[PDB]
Design a protein around this ligand. Structure first.
Ligand SMILES: Nc1ncnc2c1ncn2[C@@H]1O[C@H](COP(=O)(O)OP(=O)(O)O)[C@@H](O)[C@H]1O
Ligand SMILES: [Mg+2]
Length: 320
């Protein structure tokens, strides 16, 4: 049964429908270590035997995740993550069939032209003999593969002018792979690709300014403040002292300043923008960034509330 799993290296983003007739969205974080942290009681984990190795969930060190998007998206850690995501929602352990996501750097070349061997490479990854070490594993039978940024355009691209362009941006923890698509999917123009800076810099800098060590898996407590940067109420709760609120804000700002400092020039490098779509978790951050520089009018500037799930919705409506 088809589950749409945007298997991103920051966190995995999911959408599916069941036998009730209601559509569910879900998210499972990237937090899978190359060791077994077990549990025989209260404090409950997940543990896996992967390809031949020991894997489990704990609030992981940056070792695997702070590498590149490219390195993680085809990994054994990605195999843990996708099968973990279906267990964090809690689906009936049996089949899945999946849609999964590729970088644009990996999908499209020097001429920005495509590679299907990299499509089969994801399917080959999700062919490894993973056991849930306390249950059994969802069997991924059929596999569709898409790139990351592009499929978000799908539902909007329907009406959109076929000679004009839709510039589609994921800003992630890792991902900064960007596509210039054309309307109705008449073609694709130019791509840009990067994962050298992102929200992982921002969210980790907030941990330092708080009271928390530089791991991934306790990310929420810092991710909170990246979300509520437009507030001060949840900031006063979570950054629980006024004397720390500047420190956290200016640490966050140091990262965000230097994120803006590249991505605005990336949208100078992308000549021929006409419509803009902003997606991902950092969609909110690039909305605050790129709108004031690009100066495209709001009828051609797309970003919802959901932000990261905007991507997996465009994937969903292709075929379940
Ligand atoms: N509203 C928001 N404002 C700012 N950052 C956000 C927001 N929502 C999520 N994020 C953060 O953005 C990152 C996730 O980016 P995302 O694009 O969803 O992952 P990926 O790039 O792997 O696709 C996380 O650090 C997440 O906490
Ligand atoms: Mg992203």
């Amino acid at each position: 049964m088809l589950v749409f799993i945007d298997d991103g290296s920051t966190n995995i983003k999911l959408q599916w429908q069941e036998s009730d007739g209601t559509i569910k969205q879900h998210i499972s974080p990237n937090s899978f270590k190359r060791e077994w942290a077990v549990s025989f009681g209260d404090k409950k984990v997940f543990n896996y035997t992967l390809n031949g190795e020991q894997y489990s969930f704990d609030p992981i060190s940056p070792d695997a995740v702070v590498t590149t998007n490219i390195a993680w998206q085809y990994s054994d850690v990605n195999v843990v993550a996708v099968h973990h995501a279906l267990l964090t929602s809690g689906l009936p352990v049996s089949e899945v069939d999946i849609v999964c996501t590729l970088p644009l750097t990996e999908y499209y070349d020097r001429n920005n032209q495509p590679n299907t061997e990299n499509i089969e490479r994801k399917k080959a990854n999700f062919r490894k003999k993973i056991t849930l070490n306390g249950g059994d594993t969802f069997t991924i039978k059929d596999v569709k593969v898409m790139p990351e940024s592009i499929p978000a355009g799908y539902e909007v691209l329907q009406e959109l002018d076929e000679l004009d362009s839709l510039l589609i941006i994921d800003l992630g923890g890792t991902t900064l792979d960007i596509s210039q698509v054309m309307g109705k999917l008449s073609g694709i123009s130019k791509i840009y690709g990067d994962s050298s800076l992102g929200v992982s810099l921002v969210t980790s800098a907030v941990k330092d300014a708080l009271s928390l060590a530089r791991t991934k898996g306790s990310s929420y407590l810092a991710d909170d403040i990246i979300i509520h940067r437009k507030d001060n109420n949840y900031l006063k709760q979570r950054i629980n002292d006024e004397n720390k609120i500047s420190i956290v804000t200016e640490a966050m700002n140091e990262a965000l300043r230097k994120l803006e400092q590249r991505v605005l020039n990336t949208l100078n490098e992308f000549s021929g923008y006409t419509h803009v779509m902003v997606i991902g978790g950092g969609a909110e951050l690039i909305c605050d960034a790129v709108k004031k520089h690009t100066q495209i009018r709001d009828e051609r500037f797309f970003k919802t509330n959901n932000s990261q799930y905007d991507l997996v919705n465009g994937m969903y409506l292709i075929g379940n």
